[PDB]
């Protein structure tokens, strides 16, 4: 997953670094996810999502 | 032999018919051929709230094509100015330069864009006609009257917070005076842009272009201009002793008004408008075949809340003059042949 | 006066006048659905339809089949008028509207 | 909530 | 892809106007078929999104734990009275409109908020 | 996927479309570049005119098959089971076969759909459907014509007037 | 250009079984003729109940003084005597015509199944009085209830 | 990182209540109560600060 892969920038020169920019911390999570601090590096964003047969584009697994 | 002119009825399990029954050869005797002057006796517009940002009319007697068309040009068809160009000179703040360009094209600015005029393709320059520029330029520095404290405001702390207040406009031509000095300006002064720390600096331009919410959301006046039908909510049975409150505990809590008639309760239907269909009465198994909700057929509520561009009546009318100006374009063009 | 921005007319199979399917270019559903909606009240036209040529482009398809007599591009352009009429009237309408509900709040 | 008293 | 397994391809951007608004304004940002579930089984999505949206609608923040919730105290039923208790319906749908006719579908859909993850693997680099 | 579930909902016995849903519904499949479209007469003509939606999928298909070529016959069966649809114990009637008049049984005469409700077992991967049919008698680009024109029918009805979710009160 | 008139009375509203949405299945039987009707009629649109009876025409033709229908539907038609005796009125294509099983008896009985779109129509009966039917034949099913 | 500018469901502009927020958070105000206090009414908007992580607090910690 494109996440937020750590804090120090300017000092790490890896080869590839993929970073996002605004990341969410999940309103249902397990409660292990907040004995190991997870959000201090968050992974994702919260999404209204309706299931729904709308548009004819989002059929076999495409969204 | 029973006829229902005006509700979309609706059960659980689905909806009855997606029909209306106001169209031309569409009953006998019911037949339609437009009559202008039945819409015209037919309409009227109601308003409900009119705070800032806000408005809720109703418009009873239009169609769903109308009123989508409505929706949908308010959404993505009414012009606003917002920053489509960023020249930065310095930037040595955490936020990076296309990241600060995009939180600068989200802000919203106060400008009204029918002062203003689309930039030609490949205008690059731009001129007092159609553009606007901005400047943001602000350093951190420690203040030097502060004791041994660790609050970010009172040390560390000159603009350690850049604000949409500390853009200022530049005007780029005989735009000072037409805009007196307050009327261009950002719409909110307390939008947090970045965060600075001692010895970073921003500093750049912005270019306010015009254009139309279709093509980029950053250009979009409302925050939502959706609208619903008129609810309708019928009570078949009188519903009475502690059976009313139920009822009247399955529904937004305005609607079913329980009254006290005689000794005993009556539950009676006060306000329909305040429902929002959450269908909890056909979970109750004694009182889904008590009651009968469904919509009004023609009958709208709209809710139009801009950003602070315009005015939502403003917002309204300009709406209503984009469909007007599509219908006269395409008109003209036929004229042409 | 825009060459293709607007309007393109193909005449169906045998050109019949009574059969036109006009392109309108940078139209999505708003006006499509709206001019269809005003050109089904037309008891001389037996079948109008729209439709979005593809989501890439910017262009709808209407197909007017009109009856016998009349050429089907008067039923387009009538169609187009009484729309603009009506919003006119709405315009109207909500604009006396808003002003009364404004002197009714800033009096009281 | 309720059109203009 | 989603915290369940049901990873896809972005294969459209929607236009803001062509999308169902819901009757309280609202209008979704993603939209995803209902039929990755009957065969894939991916029953936690559909009481994700319940609890996603009854945490954004009561501010609270609810727990995912394994095994916390039985047949008797039903997750379903939990996140449903949270629903039913903010409003709306029991079982999370919502009815919405059609952004391009403009009629209100004949069946009322399910909606919610769901944590989406973004993939490493893009068409770019491939 | 959704084009079976699509008009399997929409060729079920009760259905019923108003002149401009119909059209709009029959065009939008179409999206006909060539000659006038041949329209139906409604089912029901008087208390208030309305079209089936199995004549929707009929004058869909009497467009598609080439003009110089006549609509097909066909007489097969549905996936769905006539069983299916049996809410209520069922009853005895002397005189009746249930099955000769049920939505298991596909009818397509000269090109209009008088019976049946066209799932999986046709515009599907099955083999003697209606559009395996059409592939036999007209070829393999009009079958390919009519799987074209009927998804893009199939996708308008559930965008325009009707909508597909799995919620979880199905499950429940 | 009646090709059957009878006055039945509903016996049975929905036997098989089977349910749809806005249609309903009625089992009726003819008076004075002892024929039977299977009608699939839309409800919603025109409510029907047990013990109910009505007036039942078939016909070729609304316009009841000989011109034969064009196949076009117009709502703008001119011509306004069509039958609006009626309060229903459907408009199907029979689609099978099948002798009575019986063998070795008269069993001249015929049932004619009309289909309206989707709704299905079953008439059974002597077939002296059924003769005007043929296979893929346009007809007009007009009702009117008493 | 920092709080977006506007909600990205229904644009509405939320990236000034940050502040807010949390100075009705410090006063005590639970999270329900405060996003009404803001005018934060449908719930695509209530997720956009109730789920937000300020990680330019922690990025806004080493070396200039
Ligand atoms: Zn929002």
């Given at each position: 997953?494109?996440?937020?892969?750590?804090?120090?920038?300017?000092?790490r020169?890896?080869?590839?670094?993929?970073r996002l920019?605004?990341?969410?911390?999940?309103?249902?999570?397990?409660?292990?996810?907040?004995?190991?601090?997870?959000?201090?590096?968050?992974?994702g964003?919260?999404?209204?999502?309706?299931?729904?047969?709308?548009?004819?584009?989002?059929?076999?697994?495409?969204? | 032999?029973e006829?229902?002119?005006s509700?979309?009825?609706?059960?659980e399990?689905?909806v009855?018919?997606?029909?209306?029954?106001?169209?031309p050869?569409?009953?006998?005797?019911?037949?339609?051929?437009?009559?202008?002057?039945?819409?015209?006796?037919?309409?009227?517009?109601?308003?409900?709230?009119?705070?800032?940002?806000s408005?809720?009319?109703?418009?009873?007697?239009?169609?769903?094509?109308?009123?989508?068309?409505?929706?949908?040009i308010?959404?993505?068809?009414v012009?606003?100015m917002?920053?489509?160009?960023?020249?930065?000179?310095?930037?040595?703040?955490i936020?990076?330069?296309?990241?600060?360009a995009?939180?600068?094209?989200?802000?919203?600015?106060?400008?009204?864009p029918?002062?203003?005029?689309?930039?030609?393709q490949?205008?690059?320059?731009?001129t007092?006609?159609?553009?606007?520029?901005?400047?943001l330029?602000?350093?951190?520095?420690?203040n030097?009257?502060?004791?041994?404290d660790?609050?970010?405001?009172?040390?560390?702390?000159?603009?350690?917070?850049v604000?949409?207040?500390?853009?200022?406009w530049?005007?780029?031509?005989?735009?000072?005076?037409?805009?007196?000095?307050?009327?261009?300006?950002?719409?909110?002064?307390?939008?947090?842009?970045?965060?600075?720390?001692?010895?970073?600096?921003?500093?750049?331009l912005?270019?306010?272009?015009?254009?139309?919410?279709?093509?980029?959301?950053?250009?979009?006046?409302?925050?939502?201009?959706?609208?619903?039908?008129?609810?309708?909510?019928?009570?078949?049975?009188?519903?009475?002793?502690?059976?009313?409150?139920?009822?009247?505990?399955?529904?937004?809590?305005?609607?079913?008004?329980?009254?006290?008639?005689?000794?005993?309760?009556?539950?009676?239907?006060?306000?329909?408008?305040?429902?929002?269909f959450?269908?909890?009465?056909?979970?109750?198994?004694?009182?889904?075949?008590?009651?009968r909700l469904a919509?009004?057929?023609?009958?709208?509520?709209?809710?139009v809340?801009?950003?602070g561009?315009?005015?939502?009546?403003?917002?309204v009318?300009?709406?209503?003059?984009?469909?007007?100006?599509?219908?006269?374009r395409?008109?003209?063009?036929?004229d042409?042949? | 006066?825009?060459?293709?921005t607007?309007?393109?007319?193909?005449?169906?199979?045998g050109?019949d006048?009574?059969?036109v399917?006009?392109?309108?270019?940078?139209?999505?559903?708003?006006?499509?659905?709206?001019?269809?909606?005003?050109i089904?009240?037309?008891?001389?036209?037996?079948?109008?339809?729209?439709?979005?040529?593809?989501?890439?482009?910017?262009?709808?398809?209407?197909?007017?089949?009109?009856?016998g007599?009349?050429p089907?591009?008067?039923?387009?352009?009538?169609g187009?008028?009484?729309?603009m009429?009506?919003?006119?009237?709405?315009?109207?309408?909500?604009?006396?509207?808003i002003?009364?509900?404004?002197?009714?709040?800033?009096?009281? | 909530g309720?059109?203009?008293? | 892809?989603?915290?369940?397994?049901?990873?896809?391809?972005?294969?459209?951007?929607?236009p803001?106007e062509?999308?169902?608004?819901?009757?309280?304004?609202?209008?979704?940002?993603?939209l995803?078929?209902?039929?990755?579930?009957?065969?894939?089984?991916?029953?936690?999505?559909?009481?994700?999104?319940?609890?996603?949206?009854?945490?954004?609608l009561?501010?609270?923040?609810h727990?995912?734990?394994?095994?916390?919730?039985?047949?008797?105290?039903?997750?379903?039923?939990?996140?449903?009275?949270?629903?039913?208790?903010?409003?709306?319906?029991?079982?999370?749908?919502?009815?919405?409109y059609?952004?391009?006719?403009?009629?209100?579908?004949?069946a009322?859909?399910?909606?919610?908020?769901?944590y989406?993850?973004?993939?490493?693997?893009?068409?770019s680099?491939? | 996927?959704?084009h079976?579930?699509?008009?399997?909902?929409?060729?079920?016995?009760?259905?019923?479309f108003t002149?401009?849903?119909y059209?709009?519904?029959?065009?939008?499949?179409?999206?006909?570049?060539?000659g006038?479209?041949?329209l139906?007469?409604?089912?029901?003509l008087?208390?208030?005119?309305?079209?089936?939606?199995?004549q929707?999928?009929?004058?869909?298909?009497?467009?598609?098959i080439?003009?110089?070529h006549?609509?097909?016959n066909?007489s097969?069966?549905?996936?769905?089971?006539?069983?299916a649809w049996?809410?209520?114990?069922?009853?005895?009637?002397?005189?009746?076969?249930?099955?000769?008049?049920?939505?298991?049984?596909?009818?397509?005469?000269?090109?209009?759909?008088?019976?049946?409700?066209?799932?999986?077992?046709?515009?599907?991967?099955?083999?003697?459907?209606?559009?395996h049919?059409?592939?036999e008698?007209?070829?393999?680009?009009?079958?390919?014509?009519?799987?074209?024109?009927?998804?893009?029918?199939?996708?308008?009805?559930?965008?325009?007037?009707?909508?597909?979710?799995?919620?979880?009160?199905?499950?429940? | 250009?009646?090709?059957?008139?009878?006055?039945?009375d509903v016996?049975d509203?929905?036997?098989?079984?089977?349910?749809?949405?806005?249609?309903?299945?009625?089992?009726?039987?003819?008076?004075?003729?002892?024929?039977?009707l299977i009608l699939?009629?839309?409800?919603?649109?025109?409510?029907?109940?047990?013990?109910?009876?009505?007036?039942?025409?078939?016909?070729?033709?609304?316009?009841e003084?000989?011109?034969?229908?064009?196949?076009?539907?117009?709502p703008?038609?001119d011509?306004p005597?069509?039958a609006?005796?009626?309060?229903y009125?459907?408009?199907?294509?029979?689609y099978?015509?099948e002798?009575?099983?019986?063998?070795?008896e008269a069993?001249?009985?015929?049932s004619?199944?009309?289909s309206?779109g989707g709704?299905?129509?079953?008439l059974?009966?002597?077939?002296?009085?059924?003769?005007?039917?043929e296979?893929?034949?346009?007809?007009?099913?007009?009702?009117?209830k008493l | 990182?920092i709080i977006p500018?506007?909600?990205?469901?229904?644009?509405?502009?939320?990236?000034?209540?940050?502040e807010?927020?949390?100075?009705?958070?410090?006063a005590?105000?639970?999270?329900?109560?405060?996003?009404?206090?803001?005018?934060?009414?449908?719930?695509?908007?209530?997720?956009?600060?109730?789920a937000?992580?300020?990680?330019?607090?922690?990025?806004?910690?080493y070396?200039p």
């Amino acid at each position: 997953t494109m996440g937020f892969p750590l804090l120090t920038y300017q000092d790490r020169s890896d080869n590839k670094l993929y970073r996002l920019q605004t990341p969410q911390s999940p309103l249902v999570r397990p409660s292990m996810y907040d004995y190991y601090d997870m959000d201090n590096y968050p992974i994702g964003t919260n999404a209204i999502v309706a299931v729904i047969s709308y548009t004819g584009y989002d059929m076999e697994d495409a969204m | 032999v029973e006829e229902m002119r005006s509700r979309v009825v609706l059960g659980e399990f689905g909806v009855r018919n997606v029909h209306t029954t106001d169209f031309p050869g569409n009953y006998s005797g019911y037949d339609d051929a437009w009559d202008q002057d039945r819409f015209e006796k037919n309409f009227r517009v109601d308003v409900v709230h009119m705070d800032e940002n806000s408005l809720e009319f109703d418009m009873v007697g239009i169609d769903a094509a109308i009123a989508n068309a409505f929706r949908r040009i308010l959404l993505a068809e009414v012009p606003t100015m917002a920053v489509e160009k960023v020249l930065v000179y310095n930037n040595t703040s955490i936020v990076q330069d296309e990241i600060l360009a995009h939180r600068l094209g989200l802000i919203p600015i106060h400008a009204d864009p029918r002062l203003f005029e689309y930039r030609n393709q490949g205008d690059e320059e731009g001129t007092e006609i159609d553009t606007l520029q901005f400047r943001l330029q602000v350093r951190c520095t420690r203040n030097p009257h502060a004791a041994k404290d660790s609050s970010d405001p009172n040390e560390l702390y000159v603009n350690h917070k850049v604000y949409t207040r500390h853009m200022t406009w530049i005007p780029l031509g005989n735009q000072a005076d037409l805009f007196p000095e307050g009327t261009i300006r950002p719409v909110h002064d307390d939008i947090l842009i970045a965060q600075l720390r001692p010895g970073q600096e921003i500093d750049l331009l912005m270019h306010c272009v015009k254009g139309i919410g279709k093509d980029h959301a950053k250009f979009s006046p409302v925050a939502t201009a959706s609208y619903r039908l008129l609810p309708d909510i019928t009570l078949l049975e009188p519903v009475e002793g502690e059976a009313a409150e139920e009822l009247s505990r399955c529904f937004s809590p305005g609607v079913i008004e329980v009254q006290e008639v005689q000794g005993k309760k009556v539950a009676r239907v006060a306000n329909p408008r305040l429902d929002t269909f959450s269908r909890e009465i056909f979970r109750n198994e004694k009182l889904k075949k008590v009651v009968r909700l469904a919509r009004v057929r023609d009958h709208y509520i709209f809710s139009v809340e801009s950003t602070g561009v315009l005015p939502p009546d403003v917002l309204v009318s300009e709406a209503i003059k984009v469909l007007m100006g599509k219908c006269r374009r395409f008109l003209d063009e036929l004229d042409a042949v | 006066g825009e060459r293709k921005t607007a309007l393109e007319m193909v005449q169906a199979a045998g050109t019949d006048r009574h059969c036109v399917t006009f392109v309108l270019h940078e139209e999505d559903h708003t006006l499509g659905n709206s001019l269809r909606y005003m050109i089904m009240k037309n008891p001389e036209v037996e079948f109008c339809g729209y439709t979005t040529t593809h989501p890439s482009e910017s262009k709808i398809n209407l197909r007017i089949q009109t009856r016998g007599t009349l050429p089907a591009v008067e039923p387009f352009q009538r169609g187009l008028n009484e729309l603009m009429n009506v919003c006119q009237h709405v315009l109207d309408k909500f604009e006396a509207s808003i002003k009364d509900y404004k002197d009714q709040k800033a009096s009281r | 909530g309720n059109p203009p008293v | 892809a989603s915290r369940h397994g049901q990873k896809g391809i972005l294969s459209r951007l929607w236009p803001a106007e062509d999308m169902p608004f819901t009757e309280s304004g609202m209008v979704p940002d993603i939209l995803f078929n209902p039929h990755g579930f009957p065969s894939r089984m991916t029953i936690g999505m559909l009481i994700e999104s319940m609890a996603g949206k009854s945490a954004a609608l009561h501010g609270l923040c609810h727990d995912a734990t394994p095994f916390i919730f039985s047949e008797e105290n039903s997750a379903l039923e939990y996140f449903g009275e949270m629903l039913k208790a903010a409003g709306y319906n029991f079982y999370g749908t919502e009815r919405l409109y059609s952004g391009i006719s403009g009629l209100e579908l004949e069946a009322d859909i399910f909606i919610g908020v769901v944590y989406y993850q973004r993939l490493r693997h893009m068409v770019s680099d491939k | 996927q959704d084009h079976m579930v699509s008009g399997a909902s929409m060729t079920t016995r009760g259905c019923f479309f108003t002149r401009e849903h119909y059209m709009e519904l029959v065009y939008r499949g179409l999206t006909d570049k060539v000659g006038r479209v041949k329209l139906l007469s409604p089912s029901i003509l008087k208390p208030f005119p309305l079209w089936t939606g199995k004549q929707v999928v009929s004058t869909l298909l009497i467009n598609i098959i080439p003009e110089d070529h006549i609509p097909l016959n066909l007489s097969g069966k549905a996936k769905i089971t006539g069983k299916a649809w049996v809410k209520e114990t069922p009853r005895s009637v002397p005189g009746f076969n249930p099955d000769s008049m049920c939505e298991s049984q596909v009818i397509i005469r000269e090109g209009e759909l008088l019976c049946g409700v066209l799932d999986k077992a046709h515009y599907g991967s099955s083999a003697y459907g209606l559009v395996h049919c059409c592939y036999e008698i007209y070829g393999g680009e009009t079958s390919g014509k009519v799987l074209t024109c009927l998804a893009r029918l199939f996708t308008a009805y559930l965008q325009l007037y009707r909508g597909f979710t799995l919620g979880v009160e199905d499950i429940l | 250009g009646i090709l059957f008139e009878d006055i039945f009375d509903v016996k049975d509203i929905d036997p098989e079984g089977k349910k749809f949405d806005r249609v309903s299945r009625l089992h009726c039987e003819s008076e004075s003729f002892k024929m039977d009707l299977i009608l699939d009629v839309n409800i919603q649109i025109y409510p029907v109940d047990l013990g109910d009876k009505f007036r039942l025409v078939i016909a070729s033709t609304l316009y009841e003084d000989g011109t034969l229908d064009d196949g076009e539907y117009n709502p703008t038609d001119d011509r306004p005597s069509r039958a609006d005796q009626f309060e229903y009125v459907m408009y199907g294509k029979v689609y099978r015509i099948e002798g009575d099983e019986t063998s070795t008896e008269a069993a001249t009985r015929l049932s004619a199944y009309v289909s309206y779109g989707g709704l299905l129509m079953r008439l059974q009966g002597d077939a002296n009085n059924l003769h005007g039917f043929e296979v893929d034949s346009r007809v007009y099913l007009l009702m009117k209830k008493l | 990182m920092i709080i977006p500018v506007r909600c990205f469901t229904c644009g509405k502009i939320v990236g000034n209540k940050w502040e807010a927020y949390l100075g009705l958070l410090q006063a005590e105000y639970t999270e329900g109560d405060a996003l009404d206090a803001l005018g934060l009414k449908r719930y695509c908007c209530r997720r956009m600060l109730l789920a937000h992580v300020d990680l330019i607090e922690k990025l806004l910690n080493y070396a200039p």
